[PDB]
Amino acid sequence: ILQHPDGTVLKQLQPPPRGPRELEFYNMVYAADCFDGVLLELRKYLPKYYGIWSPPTAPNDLYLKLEDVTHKFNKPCIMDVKIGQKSYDPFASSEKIQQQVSKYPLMEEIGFLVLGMRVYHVHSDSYETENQHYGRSLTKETIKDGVSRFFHNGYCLRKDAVAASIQKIEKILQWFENQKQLNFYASSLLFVYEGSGGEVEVRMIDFAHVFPSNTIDEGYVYGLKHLISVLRSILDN
């Protein structure tokens, strides 16, 4: 991921089939001639898409040019959370299924996995970050405190940002409850709040494993509902 000062990010296409699939996901949703109401609403929850991009001197080198969801913040606090009961897609080999389940065998039970976070601490005017091994070390017993950490700025828990997050996830959940045409594996919600105070973003990102479907994405629903339940209990702290 490359950050550009024009308020965008450039995401390098992953090797095939993943990179091509994500490109085609964005091309589908943001198709200029799209009048599918489900896809038009979905746009609200994704980064704005500016199309494929390459360097003028390197057509081989493929990126997606996307809205940088953090751009409008002064001290953005960011968390990436993978959503769903399965982080492997319908065409995964046994090996890949085993890889992905062994990254976090609790995915079926919890329905989400924190991939990382960067949190602004007001007293020190500095950031603390957690990596992939943080959220993968979270159990049912520790998931609530694990998530809460994102919203604590070194002296108070930001219940405003927790409540806003629930409210935004709720709209995404509603989108999911009214579509049966796409199922999302290994996708994420990107959470941003202002660390320095009410602006909050929750956007869907990372679409290398989105597939057409004829069913509700029950894994994705389960994950969102559980994530909301956790966030709700944090409001009682």
Ligand X SMILES: Nc1ncnc2c1ncn2[C@@H]1O[C@H](COP(=O)(O)OP(=O)(O)O)[C@@H](O)[C@H]1O
Ligand Y SMILES: O=P(O)(O)O[C@@H]1[C@H](O)[C@H](O)[C@@H](OP(=O)(O)O)[C@H](OP(=O)(O)O)[C@H]1O
Query: Of 23, 26, 42, 47, which one interacts with ligand X (CB under 6 A)?
Result: 47
Per-residue contact string for residues 120-139; x = within reach of ligand Y by CB under 6 A: ------------x-------
**What residues numbered 183-202 form the site for ligand Y, per CB under 6 A?**
186
Instruction: Please check whether residue 99 is in contact with residue 79, taking contact to mean a CB–CB distance below 8 angstroms.
Output: no
Q: How far, CA to CA in Å, does 179 sit from each of 94, 135, 187, 195, 226?
A: 29, 29, 17, 34, 19
124 to 163: interface string for ligand X, x by CB under 6 A: ----------------------------------------
Shortest Cβ 11–Mg ion spacing (Å): 9
SS3 106: coil
Residues binding ligand Y: number (CB under 6 A): 5
Q: Which amino acid is at 220?
A: Y
Pick the binder of Mg ion from 22, 89, 194, 206 (CB under 5 A). Answer: 206
3-class secondary structure, 224 = helix
Q: Which does 160 bind (CB under 5 to 8 A by kind): ligand Y, ligand X, Mg ion, none?
A: none
Distance CA 21, CA 24 (A): 5
Residue 20's closest CA among 212, 207, 183? 207
Helix (H) or strand (E) holding 162: helix 159-177
Interface residue list for ligand Y (CB under 6 A): 18, 103, 132, 186, 208
Annotated binding-site members for ATP: 11, 67-69, 80, 206
